[PDB]
Symmetry: none
Subunit: 130 residues, 2 copies
């Protein structure tokens, strides 16, 4: 049938203590993680996709077939945001490497990191996290 | 400046032991309490506003300039939910009384109390509760 994703409420917590909720689709399967947000033409400002690699290891992301400009947050197993790549470029096959082992990647609309005042070292929290 | 409130994670804890997390904005001076949730057209199911009266006394609420239907929970200083008025009516000037003295009111989307299985006697916990 139609591809489905588990959804969940997560929150970004910043160093200032500010909290902001998001609704994310969980990309768990290999096909879900590879398809990512390909072909989607819209996505609400507080919605994103949380890629759950099921292990801690470096990861590689790209923008192949992706129309929405995105911010990418590379996240440790304890929810710490290690690095952030803002304004990934639609359609680009340039690899964006995590540069170090991580457990998750959060993709949000481009500009979301700025809108929410998020920085590396801030945290994502939710059901499995930390 | 953009209107802001201190914004907190709080948790409803039912008598049966179930927990439900929320993020609430804190209305803590007279102007904030009198204007809390006016104008808003949308609010997530797990969001609300916590009105902090700075003391324990009878309180009075209404729905002037309020577009969202809301559930009101009247809460003691220790976080115990004393009474609940579900399904307050957008724009209604009807005055909703705690009757007894309380320290807080939590406003949620209408129907939230029923959806979460919350009752009088249940508890709200957070930083400060
Ligand atoms: Cl801040
Ligand atoms: Cl779409």
């Amino acid at each position: 049938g139609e591809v489905s994703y588990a959804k969940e409420r997560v929150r970004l917590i910043t160093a200032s203590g500010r909290t902001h909720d998001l609704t994310v689709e969980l990309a768990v399967d290999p096909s879900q993680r590879e398809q990512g947000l390909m072909y989607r033409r819209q996505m609400a400002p507080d919605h994103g996709m949380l890629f759950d690699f099921g292990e801690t290891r470096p990861v590689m992301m790209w923008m192949k077939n992706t129309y929405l400009p995105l911010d990418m947050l590379f996240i440790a197993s304890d929810g710490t945001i290690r690095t952030i790549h803002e304004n990934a470029v639609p359609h680009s096959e340039a690899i964006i490497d995590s540069r170090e082992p991580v457990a998750y990647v959060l993709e949000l609309n481009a500009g979301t990191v700025k809108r929410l005042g998020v920085s590396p070292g801030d945290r994502l929290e939710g059901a499995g996290l930390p």
